[PDB]
């Protein structure tokens, strides 16, 4: 029930590394050149550092700061680019009627083992969730019709099937293959991820895509 431990575990605040710096040792620091010092800071923030340790740490602090300062503009610029490319793209109709589609793999070939291993949960969820089915799919005695927007549950089901070797990949409608002019169609786009339902025709999909891709920009290290 320790306050640090609790705040971390709950996800209220804090993470393991920070807790480490508070309680255990501070760790190794890096010179400005990028290569790390031979002696680590042994002190914790509880114990307090030595002026030498402290100064040693300042290099990293600063490097990080400047990094963030620059990445910020890099990301900003990126976002503006993306917005400029995607802006005209809007949901302009319910069905472009295309027969085409894209095939989302549940298995990624592992090069370390030269074998095949199931994709991670979140990866697959990101590939499948709220997508309309391009083709009918039957796994574990459940029929998933064409035109069916996959619920998070639907996706979990499909994963479980893929664990029973029932299905290796899923056919799905997608903007890549959509044949709507000057935009996209409801079916090819899928869920308005914000409402967990079919996207309403007229939603500005491009701008949303740009904002979505770019907003985390400053977080990528």
């Amino acid at each position: 029930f320790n306050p640090l431990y609790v705040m971390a575990q709950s996800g209220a605040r804090g993470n393991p590394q920070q807790i480490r710096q508070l309680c255990g040792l501070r760790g190794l620091m890096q010179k400005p050149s990028g290569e790390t010092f031979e002696v680590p800071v042994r002190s914790s923030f509880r114990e307090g550092l030595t002026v030498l340790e402290y100064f040693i740490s300042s290099h990293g602090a600063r490097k990080g700061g400047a990094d963030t300062a620059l990445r910020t503009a890099d990301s900003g610029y990126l976002t503006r680019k993306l917005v400029d490319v995607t802006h005209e793209i809007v949901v302009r109709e319910a069905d472009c009627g295309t027969t085409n589609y894209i095939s989302v793999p549940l298995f990624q070939p592992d090069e370390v083992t030269r074998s095949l291993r199931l994709r991670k949960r979140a990866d697959i969820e990101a590939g499948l969730y709220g997508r309309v089915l391009a083709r009918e799919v039957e796994v574990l005695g459940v029929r998933l019709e064409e035109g069916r927007y996959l619920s998070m549950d639907d996706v979990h089901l499909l994963i479980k099937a893929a664990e029973a070797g029932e299905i290796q990949e899923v056919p799905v409608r997608s903007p890549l293959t959509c044949q709507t002019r000057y935009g996209v169609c409801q079916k090819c786009y899928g869920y308005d991820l914000s409402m967990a339902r079919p996207v309403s025709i007229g939603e500005a999909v491009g701008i949303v895509a740009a904002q979505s891709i770019g907003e985390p920009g400053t977080q990528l290290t």
Binding site: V85, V205, Q219
Partner: protein, 143 residues
């Protein structure tokens, strides 16, 4: 994004990438007016070609063209958009020589004109929807 612990739907990245692939390079005009090596939108060539082949003419041979978000952005049909985004003088001179007309398809164009945008409550789909109470309804039903 995954490495950085960021949940982001493939959908969006796909939306952008599709715009990266929006263009093609011409390998043979066949019997078309277009000339070899010249870039244009996959849409436009698919349409033209269907006109040719369906009219009994030789089709145009085209090659897929990948180009980054910036170049693609500057290559958009709308000159208001392109001239807004970057390379204003270039875009504008190349546009003015050609005497381009902007059809106001995109958000940017309309924002610039102060127009009501083609998305949301401005979408032609829902834009014209009417509301009338039953009373007035039957009332006009007489004709």
């Amino acid at each position: 994004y995954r490495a950085q612990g960021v949940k982001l739907h493939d959908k969006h990245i796909e939306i952008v990438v599709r715009q990266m692939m929006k263009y093609v390079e011409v390998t043979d005009p066949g019997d078309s007016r277009l000339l070899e090596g010249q870039v244009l939108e996959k849409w436009d060539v698919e349409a033209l070609n269907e006109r040719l082949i369906a009219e009994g003419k030789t089709p145009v041979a085209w090659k897929p063209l990948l180009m980054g978000v910036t170049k693609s952005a500057l290559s958009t049909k709308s000159w208001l958009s392109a001239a807004s985004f970057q390379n204003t003088t270039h875009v504008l001179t190349e546009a003015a020589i050609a005497g381009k007309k902007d059809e106001l398809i995109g958000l940017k164009e309309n924002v610039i004109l102060g127009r009501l945008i083609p998305a949301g409550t401005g979408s032609d789909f829902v834009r014209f929807t009417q509301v009338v109470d039953q009373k007035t309804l039957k009332a006009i039903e007489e004709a």
